């Protein structure tokens, strides 16, 4: 849980503020649950975590050095085009995961706000809208055979259109 990438507003639970002579069943059920279930389970988990502390091992997130883009490839030079295309595919799916993370933020915001979502989730709705516009302008209408070259052609079509609009 990286709170940054997965923002989570603070908790604001209120006071017990009881006004009834009767006993709330929930507190006693929760005490029984705690003692009976949570405690042994926590013991087991602590034992596993000690066993993990023993025999600790490490794994590293892979780093992929950048390589020339398809823009730097001479037509029909399959050798460089392959590397450019693979780089583009990796960037494509990293963008996919960006979209997943932002959509998860939006869903969590909706659930958290509840019936205030029509106002308090405006920030995340705005972020979602901007990122989906970016995603549409990057990868949409590209066939199932999407490729760096198709993306480049689409971008250049849009840039030609924008240049025309600016001229006019």
């Amino acid at each position: 849980w990286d709170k940054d990438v997965y923002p989570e507003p603070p908790s604001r639970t209120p006071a017990p503020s009881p006004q009834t002579s009767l006993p709330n069943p929930i507190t006693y059920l929760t005490k029984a649950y705690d003692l009976v279930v949570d405690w042994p389970v926590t013991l087991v988990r602590e034992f596993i975590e000690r066993q993990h502390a023993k025999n600790r091992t490490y794994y590293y997130h892979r780093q992929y050095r950048r390589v020339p883009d398809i823009t730097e490839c001479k037509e029909g030079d399959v050798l460089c085009i392959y590397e450019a295309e693979m780089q583009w595919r990796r960037d494509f799916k990293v963008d996919q995961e960006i979209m997943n993370i932002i959509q998860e933020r939006l869903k969590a915001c909706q659930q958290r706000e509840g019936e205030n979502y029509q106002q308090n989730c405006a920030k995340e709705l705005e972020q979602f809208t901007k990122v989906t516009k970016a995603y549409q302008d990057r990868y949409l209408d590209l066939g199932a055979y999407y490729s760096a070259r198709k993306c480049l052609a689409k971008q250049k079509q849009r840039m030609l259109e924008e240049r025309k609009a600016a001229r006019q």
């Binding site: 399959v78 392959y82 693979m86 199932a144 055979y145 999407y146």
Partner: protein, 459 residues
């Protein structure tokens, strides 16, 4: 890939050098182990597709099909173990050799890197399948069925040869990676349209389009169980795989050259699904169900969206497994009552209670039960086509209704109802048949657990 091909070849020496007693057991066991070995192609922890040499490669699209092919051979041997009960040893070994050769050729085809590999290894499948249909078939018209099956495909294929030669002359090569990474836009000349057709027609025939689907209802009701299984589990998917691999070059012509075949698929699906309602041959009913499903696959592939490709692949695998299971079940009842009519045998749930369970599960896979990968595929193809045009939902819904309808019709007609008590010969289900059905179902359930394996290249 050569750690999977060579054991398959060596199965043949084992088949022919084994003693008559142990031949079936040895070949079945070693074929299962070859299937296990084939799982090595799922260690793709990166986006770089596997290329084992200049000749053989694998992809997210080819690995599931290759693994399915490996899986089918043991089941084909089990299904054939019975109807070959009283044939001479050499004839039995010939059958086993034919199946082994079919597996070898199909794996090589799916793992081929050059389309003129593919065009040879794809048509080489005709010989073993033709022999299986014509030699070991039962009824007299098996000869006619073999002729249809051979020549539909050959007429389709020859234009594919011409188009491929033109492609090689124009480009300089036929390695699919090179074609992908150096493709260029076609122009809407009449010659280019004729090409598009020449490239696409052989595969469309193998994916029987509504107008050229007459060779399945014949080949299936004339072919033995193993022939039907391999055919409408792998052979039918040769067309889809070829279409997927080859459509990369044929752009942007597809935008308007797909209207005819999309329309034919989306209409023939309804027509064939309806035909399933009023057909008196169980084998034929299953064959026409297969035709409808392949109609969906063709529509999705010819619209080419990411959803289309991924759902088409998922449904390719799902149909493979499900149709195979259905044919094994129907052959189970056929081995006893020696008839193919659906009406004749009824109420068999009163005597084969467990095989009734397998029947029910197969019918659910057919009718597309959520969360089954069958549904997932059909749902995603439906989403793609709805995006393509929001009116296709009408045809899709009519087909869904009719699909459910014939799927349950099979069950009610056969499993349920008064037992045809006059059938004395109905014998308790063989452990062979039950294990065959289990081996068909369990992979389906596990893949429904883990769909990520069977998605296509796109997703």
């Amino acid at each position: 890939m050569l750690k999977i091909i060579l054991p398959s070849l060596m199965l043949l020496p084992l088949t022919w050098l084994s003693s008559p007693k142990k031949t079936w057991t040895n070949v079945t066991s070693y074929s299962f182990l070859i299937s296990l070995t084939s799982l090595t192609l799922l260690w793709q922890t990166d986006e770089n597709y596997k290329n084992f040499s200049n000749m053989f490669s694998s992809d997210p699209l080819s690995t599931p099909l290759i693994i399915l092919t490996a899986w089918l051979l043991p089941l084909m041997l089990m299904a054939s173990q019975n109807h070959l009960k009283k044939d001479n040893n050499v004839l039995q070994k010939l059958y086993i050799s034919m199946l082994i050769s079919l597996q070898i050729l199909l794996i090589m085809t799916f793992s081929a890197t050059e389309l003129i590999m593919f065009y040879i290894l794809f048509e080489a499948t005709l010989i073993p399948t033709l022999i299986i249909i014509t030699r070991w078939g039962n009824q007299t018209e098996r000869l006619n069925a073999g002729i249809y099956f051979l020549f539909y495909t050959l007429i389709g294929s020859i234009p594919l040869l011409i188009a491929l030669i033109l492609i090689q002359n124009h480009v300089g090569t036929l390695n699919l990676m090179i074609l992908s990474f150096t493709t260029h836009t076609l122009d809407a000349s009449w010659s280019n349209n004729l090409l598009w057709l020449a490239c696409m027609m052989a595969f469309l025939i193998k994916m029987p389009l509504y107008g050229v689907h007459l060779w399945l209802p014949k080949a299936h009701v004339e072919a033995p169980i193993a022939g039907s299984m391999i055919l409408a589990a792998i052979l039918l998917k040769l067309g889809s795989y070829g279409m997927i691999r080859i459509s990369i070059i044929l752009d942007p012509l597809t935008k308007y050259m797909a209207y005819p075949f999309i329309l034919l698929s989306l209409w023939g699906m309804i027509m064939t699904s309806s035909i399933c309602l009023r057909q008196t041959d169980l084998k034929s009913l299953i064959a026409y169900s297969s035709v409808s499903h392949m109609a969906l696959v063709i529509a999705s592939i010819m619209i080419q969206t990411p959803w289309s490709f991924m759902g088409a692949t998922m449904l390719m695998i799902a149909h493979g497994l499900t149709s195979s299971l259905l044919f094994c079940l129907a052959n189970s009842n056929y081995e006893r009552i020696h008839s193919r009519t659906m009406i004749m045998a009824r109420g068999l749930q009163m005597v084969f209670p467990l095989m009734a369970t397998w029947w029910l599960m197969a019918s659910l896979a057919n009718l597309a039960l959520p969360p089954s990968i069958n549904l997932m595929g059909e749902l995603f193809i439906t989403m793609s086509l709805f995006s393509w045009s929001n009116f296709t939902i009408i045809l899709m819904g009519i087909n869904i209704i009719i699909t459910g309808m014939y799927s349950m019709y099979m069950i009610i007609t056969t499993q349920r109802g008064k037992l045809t008590n006059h059938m004395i010969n109905l014998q308790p289900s063989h452990t062979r048949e039950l294990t065959l059905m289990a081996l068909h179902m369990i992979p389906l359930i596990l893949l429904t657990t883990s769909p990520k394996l069977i998605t296509g290249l796109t997703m």
